[PDB]
Design a protein around this nucleic acid. Structure first.
Ligand SMILES: [Mg+2]
Ligand SMILES: [Mg+2]
Ligand SMILES: [Mg+2]
Ligand SMILES: [Mg+2]
Ligand SMILES: [Mg+2]
Ligand SMILES: [Mg+2]
Ligand SMILES: [Mg+2]
Ligand SMILES: [Mg+2]
Ligand SMILES: [Mg+2]
Ligand SMILES: [Mg+2]
Ligand SMILES: [Mg+2]
Ligand SMILES: [Mg+2]
Ligand SMILES: [Mg+2]
Ligand SMILES: [Mg+2]
Ligand SMILES: [Mg+2]
Ligand SMILES: [Mg+2]
Ligand SMILES: [Mg+2]
Ligand SMILES: [Mg+2]
Ligand SMILES: [Mg+2]
Ligand SMILES: [Mg+2]
Ligand SMILES: [Mg+2]
Ligand SMILES: [Mg+2]
Ligand SMILES: [Mg+2]
Ligand SMILES: [Mg+2]
Ligand SMILES: [Mg+2]
Ligand SMILES: [Mg+2]
Ligand SMILES: [Mg+2]
Ligand SMILES: [Mg+2]
Ligand SMILES: [Mg+2]
Ligand SMILES: [Mg+2]
Ligand SMILES: [Mg+2]
Ligand SMILES: [Mg+2]
Ligand SMILES: [Mg+2]
Ligand SMILES: [Mg+2]
Ligand SMILES: [Mg+2]
Ligand SMILES: [Mg+2]
Ligand SMILES: [Mg+2]
Ligand SMILES: [Mg+2]
Ligand SMILES: [Mg+2]
Ligand SMILES: [Mg+2]
Ligand SMILES: [Mg+2]
Ligand SMILES: [Mg+2]
Ligand SMILES: [Mg+2]
Ligand SMILES: [Mg+2]
Ligand SMILES: [Mg+2]
Ligand SMILES: [Mg+2]
Ligand SMILES: [Mg+2]
Ligand SMILES: [Mg+2]
Ligand SMILES: [Mg+2]
Ligand SMILES: [Mg+2]
Ligand SMILES: [Mg+2]
Ligand SMILES: [Mg+2]
Ligand SMILES: [Mg+2]
Ligand SMILES: [Mg+2]
Ligand SMILES: [Mg+2]
Ligand SMILES: [Mg+2]
Ligand SMILES: [Mg+2]
Ligand SMILES: [Mg+2]
Ligand SMILES: [Mg+2]
Ligand SMILES: [Mg+2]
Ligand SMILES: [Mg+2]
Lengths: 148, 155, 144, 185
RNA sequence: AGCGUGCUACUUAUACUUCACCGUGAUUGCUGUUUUGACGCUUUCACGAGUAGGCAGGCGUGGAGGUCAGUGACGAAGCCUU
RNA sequence: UUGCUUAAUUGAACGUGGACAAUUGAAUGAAGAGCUUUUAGUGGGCCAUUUUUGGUAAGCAGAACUGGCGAUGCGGGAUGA
RNA sequence: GGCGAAAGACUAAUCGAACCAUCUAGUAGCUGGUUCCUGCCGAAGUUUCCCUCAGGAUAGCAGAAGCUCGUAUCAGUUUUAU
RNA sequence: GCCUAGACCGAGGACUGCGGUUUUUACCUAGGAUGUUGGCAUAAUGAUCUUAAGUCGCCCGUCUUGAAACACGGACCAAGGAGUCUAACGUCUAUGCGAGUGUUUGGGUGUAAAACCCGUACGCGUAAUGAAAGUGAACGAAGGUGGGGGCCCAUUAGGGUGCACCAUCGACCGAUCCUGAUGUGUUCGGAUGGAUUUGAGUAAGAGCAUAGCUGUUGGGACCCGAAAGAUGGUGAACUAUGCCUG
RNA sequence: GCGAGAGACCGAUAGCGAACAAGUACAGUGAUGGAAAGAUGAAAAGAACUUUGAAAAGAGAGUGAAAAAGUACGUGAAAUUGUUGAAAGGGAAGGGCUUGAGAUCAGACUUGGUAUUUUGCAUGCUGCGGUUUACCGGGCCAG
């Protein structure tokens, strides 16, 4: 609402809050990112270091679908087990019958190894796993089965 | 417009308990019964009169005497009076019956008041005659003459 | 300016009691062109405390109109009366600091009779500032 | 005139009331204004101040923080007080039986608390079973974990996060972030 | 009624002292009498210059939702007027 | 305690345990201390005392410290930033 | 572009580049203006960089919002020691 | 110690307090003015307007170190007249839900641009780091030390527990450098142990969405203002010059 | 372009340039440029008639709810101006503060209470104005 703006409060005061010396002008200092190397260097150097220059190699025609690989950690892995059957699985899981967790079918490419698993065997199906994620899965008596 | 609210009461609080216990008035040392006074204000301003009694209203009972002056028995305020140094012996004048209720508001003048005037003025005149020219002095009006400075005059 | 602030003299005609040591004397020497001081008698202290005595109670300026006010704030320092406070100031006592800081700075009037013709020169040179040493009592009588 | 040793007419700089116009938060302030004014219990004065706080000053408290606070020695049966929202944590392996008083509970948080035999009560229910905050334990969430705090105090050699819209090799990584491109700050 | 010097009194600033009132900041207390206002009432103390500028609380105008079963041809709105 | 140091059982740094309680180690004061975010205007200055450079000097030009004017009315200097 | 026995002359009161419409609300570190009330706080003309010197960015000065706490250990001051 | 002259003021509004005199569970001068009298109510009293007198008072706005200026705009009056909207954002605040969040591209539905309902995807978040190939976050009660509100036990003090947060020493992940186990497409692999190195990381998530103020950038961009530049057209009724005919 | 329905839009200096005989009047050789301008009253009932005047008009009259609606038309502000009235005024005027004077406005004999007599009510003496002297007390200005 315009009735809440300070434009309504500046009515009657000559300069509308812009100053009598400074005299609000069109574009003192330039337009946009003008003078970033000359008179706005003190701003870009302080607040945006790394702005100028090239780093790394180009990639013509980069298709981001190639690099799709969402991560799921181990402390979040049992959320992919059915909620209505999690508690039964946490009790009756053994080497003979352990829950299967299809991580790709839930939208994940790599299993990472942050956190702790329940000391319960699981079968984790993944495209990729980290070294520590698979070590933690095997320690609880589980296994990682690679899929594609 | 802003309507009155329910919490805007109209009850009048009682006053707090006041500690202004009155104490009696103190008259000037020059105000002694029998003193000749000069009236400064009122109808009888400038009249020289005899001071008789201190009423309980903080006023002074005063007579001309009426025969000498035309100023009857009445009250005056001590602050509208110059207390001179001339004195008349009023020990023989009975002013017992005179008080605030005597001068109560009820032209025609009461027979009681005329009788009291005559009885008081008889004794007043008997004592006034002793001092020569005192009756003539009381019958003459007071005024400030050219070159009279009341801050330098003795009364 | 800082010295006058540390003496709690932040207005004209404000008075305060100071216990003389080397430190406080060297403080007062810095404020000398702006203050008049001297050695106060017992009757001057009593008149000051009786007429213009106020206490600092919860950072508020409270009149010393009852001995309970003084006791509630200075009873742990064995001050139970206005006369205990006056004695503690006069014969500079072991608890002079607390008793004098409890006293709000005295707010005096202008002198009845005026100052000398020109205030802001030393009392020795015919002015009003500096140490006048027993004539502070006459000045306080003028101003209190 | 006065020689002012401090700025005149300065407001305290603390909230004396909630900015919220929620009438039910104002009922809680009414209840704890009475408790803080009259019980001498320091707990009630802290709760009254916390009810004034803004949203970022009342970060969510995960059900894992409460679990860790109940694992303090001699705190297993204390009443957990959270002036704010209690959220769920699907990274817990187990949750104890506990009494928790909060402004709000998420659906998952309340479900897990009640599933394990505990209570999820409001701050007014707290004031009747503990009008002096007896046997309580106030839990506060992390304030400096907020994303906005990453960029506070940015400067050379400060190690903070730049205010930037895109992330990648082409966005503020060359000159001033690399010795091969001039200098590094 | 000049110059140097001393003294007494006296004159008066929006300054100082006491008091009233306004506002701001802090502060005292208020639910078995909290009692149809607790965003309220109440105790106490201190303070108040201001350009550029910031913020707060209000006044006024066109139109919109709601409400006053509001005013009005027995005179709306507008306009003039110690 | 150590992988440092010493010829060393020597030290260096950080510690467990024990003793020294409000005169806990000068004064005075303290409308409390500490912390953070965000944004405005400004980036022509000038004057007075004292120090001071150039200049014969200047209501001149240039610095130092403080206080002022700018941004400020009020009493005095007749008048006057 | 014309035309000029040449003056930058003349080319419809227009000429060192006509007139009309449009691009076009061209851009302006420059000049001018910028509309109600009260309350509270309240500056800077200085640092560094800039084809920088009538301008910016930066730091400082200012406001606002607060937050953590409640005398904790601070000060445009003195003293003592060095 | 005592006597004495005058001026200004009267905030508060049952009681509560501190004292004093006690002849007394009473009285007082002691937590803020009462008593009494007169007059007036066709009025004494108060306010405003006009005017006189006394005293003070330069023309506003503006840029400026400095304006009443012999600096600029303003003869007068009415009506109009200048920080807006949008895309993308920073801080803060309110709200809903919360490891999620966002119905509104669309579909359903409708009393028909509304309201109501639906869900897949997608966006942001939940993982970082490296130029990249790539790799990818628990020694421990998610660590130790000094503080730390609150809570618990106490009984000044004292002890226990200590979230947020502050300082500090560590641990984990990525990059860089060093070391280089069993092994092997003999050039690959990279276990293990390290390093005054480095990251916008981990270390029991905090975000997402809507709205508001303020600030930012691009847009006509607070309003008005160039000298210029370009594209496409209209003019030799004036005038310059040639020609034709008088 | 044609045909429709709408709006937290503008309300005659606004909204299209144009609410009207508006791309009109008018300008320019030309390309082009380009306005101003809505409102009597329900209805003309748009003032018959007499009189003064050369006439325009005026004065009577008439219509109308209104002529304080007469086409120079609803309302009819300001600048600016006439008349009447009031006041002030020696090379400006205007302003603030204060009081006087003149003018205006305001307010307690209160919604005053106490008994009292008569004038008036639909009515069967009862709510209650009315009056003057008494008393209680109040308001204001003062000693
Ligand atoms: Mg201003
Ligand atoms: Mg203006
Ligand atoms: Mg501004
Ligand atoms: Mg301007
Ligand atoms: Mg500027
Ligand atoms: Mg005198
Ligand atoms: Mg003098
Ligand atoms: Mg003041
Ligand atoms: Mg983070
Ligand atoms: Mg290179
Ligand atoms: Mg003279
Ligand atoms: Mg002389
Ligand atoms: Mg004053
Ligand atoms: Mg101010
Ligand atoms: Mg509008
Ligand atoms: Mg009606
Ligand atoms: Mg700026
Ligand atoms: Mg700047
Ligand atoms: Mg200059
Ligand atoms: Mg400038
Ligand atoms: Mg200036
Ligand atoms: Mg000044
Ligand atoms: Mg002057
Ligand atoms: Mg002179
Ligand atoms: Mg030439
Ligand atoms: Mg020509
Ligand atoms: Mg423009
Ligand atoms: Mg420039
Ligand atoms: Mg100020
Ligand atoms: Mg350059
Ligand atoms: Mg300029
Ligand atoms: Mg009173
Ligand atoms: Mg003058
Ligand atoms: Mg100007
Ligand atoms: Mg100049
Ligand atoms: Mg000016
Ligand atoms: Mg001049
Ligand atoms: Mg000129
Ligand atoms: Mg100019
Ligand atoms: Mg002009
Ligand atoms: Mg207007
Ligand atoms: Mg999603
Ligand atoms: Mg994502
Ligand atoms: Mg990657
Ligand atoms: Mg973390
Ligand atoms: Mg232009
Ligand atoms: Mg042009
Ligand atoms: Mg060009
Ligand atoms: Mg021709
Ligand atoms: Mg339409
Ligand atoms: Mg138009
Ligand atoms: Mg038009
Ligand atoms: Mg019209
Ligand atoms: Mg005729
Ligand atoms: Mg009419
Ligand atoms: Mg009409
Ligand atoms: Mg008309
Ligand atoms: Mg007029
Ligand atoms: Mg003349
Ligand atoms: Mg007058
Ligand atoms: Mg008068």
């Amino acid at each position: 609402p315009t009735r809440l703006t300070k434009t309504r409060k500046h009515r009657g005061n000559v300069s509308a809050g812009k100053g009598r010396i400074g005299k609000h002008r069109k574009h003192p200092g330039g337009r946009g990112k003008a003078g970033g190397q000359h008179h706005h260097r003190t701003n870009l150097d302080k607040y945006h270091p790394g702005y100028f220059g090239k780093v790394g190699m180009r990639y013509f025609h980069k298709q981001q679908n190639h690099f799709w690989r969402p991560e799921i950690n181990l402390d979040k892995l049992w959320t992919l087990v059915d909620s209505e059957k999690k508690d039964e699985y946490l009790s009756k899981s053994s080497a003979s019958a352990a829950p299967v967790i299809d991580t790709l079918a839930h939208g994940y490419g790599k299993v990472l190894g942050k956190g702790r698993l329940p000391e319960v065997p699981v079968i984790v199906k993944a495209r990729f796993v980290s070294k520590l994620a698979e070590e933690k899965i095997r320690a609880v008596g589980g296994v990682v089965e690679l899929v594609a | 417009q802003v309507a009155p609210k329910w919490y805007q009461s109209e009850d009048v609080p009682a006053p707090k308990q006041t500690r202004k216990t009155a104490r009696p008035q103190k008259l000037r040392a020059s105000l002694v019964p029998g003193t000749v006074l000069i009236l400064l204000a009122g109808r009888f301003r400038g009249k020289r009169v005899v001071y008789l009694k201190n009423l309980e209203d903080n006023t002074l009972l005063v007579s001309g005497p009426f025969k000498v002056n035309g100023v009857p028995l009445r009250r005056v305020n001590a602050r509208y009076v110059i207390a001179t140094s001339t004195k008349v012996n009023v020990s023989g004048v009975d002013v017992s019956k005179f008080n605030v209720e005597y001068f109560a508001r009820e032209k025609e003048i009461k027979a009681e008041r005329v009788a009291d005037q005559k009885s008081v003025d008889a004794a007043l005149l008997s004592e006034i005659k002793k001092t020569p020219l005192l009756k003539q002095y009381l019958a003459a009006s007071f005024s400030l003459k050219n070159g009279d400075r009341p801050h330098l005059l003795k009364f | 300016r800082k010295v006058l602030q540390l003496l709690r003299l932040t207005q004209i005609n404000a008075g305060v009691f100071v216990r003389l040591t080397k430190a406080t004397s060297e403080l007062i020497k810095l404020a000398e062109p702006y203050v008049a001081y001297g050695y106060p008698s017992l009757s001057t202290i009593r008149q000051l405390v009786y007429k213009r005595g106020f206490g600092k109670v919860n950072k508020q300026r409270i009149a010393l109109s009852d001995n309970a006010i003084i006791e509630a704030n200075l009873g742990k320092f064995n001050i139970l009366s206005i006369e205990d406070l006056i004695h503690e100031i006069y014969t500079v006592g072991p608890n002079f600091k607390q008793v004098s800081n409890f006293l709000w700075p005295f707010k005096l009037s202008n002198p009845n009779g005026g100052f000398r013709a020109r205030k802001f020169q030393h009392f020795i040179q015919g002015g009003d500032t500096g140490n006048r040493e027993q004539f502070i009592n006459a000045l306080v009588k003028q101003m209190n | 005139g006065r020689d002012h040793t401090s700025k005149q007419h300065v407001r305290s700089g603390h909230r004396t009331a909630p900015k919220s116009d929620n009438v039910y938060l104002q009922l809680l302030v009414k209840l704890y204004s009475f408790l803080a004014r009259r019980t001498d219990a320091p707990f009630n004065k802290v709760i009254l101040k916390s009810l004034f706080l803004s949203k970022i000053n009342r970060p969510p408290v995960s059900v894992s923080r409460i679990s860790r606070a109940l694992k303090q020695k001699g705190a297993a049966e204390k009443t957990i007080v959270v002036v704010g929202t209690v959220t769920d944590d699907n990274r817990l392996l187990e949750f104890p039986k506990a009494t928790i008083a909060a402004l709000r509970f998420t659906a998952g948080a309340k479900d897990r608390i009640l599933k394990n035999g505990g209570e999820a009560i409001t701050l007014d229910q707290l004031a009747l079973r503990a009008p002096k905050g007896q046997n309580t334990l106030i839990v506060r969430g992390p304030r400096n974990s907020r994303e906005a705090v990453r960029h506070f105090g940015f400067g050379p050699h400060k190690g903070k996060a730049p205010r930037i819209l895109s992330k990648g090799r082409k966005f503020e990584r060359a000159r001033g972030r690399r010795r091969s491109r001039g200098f590094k700050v």
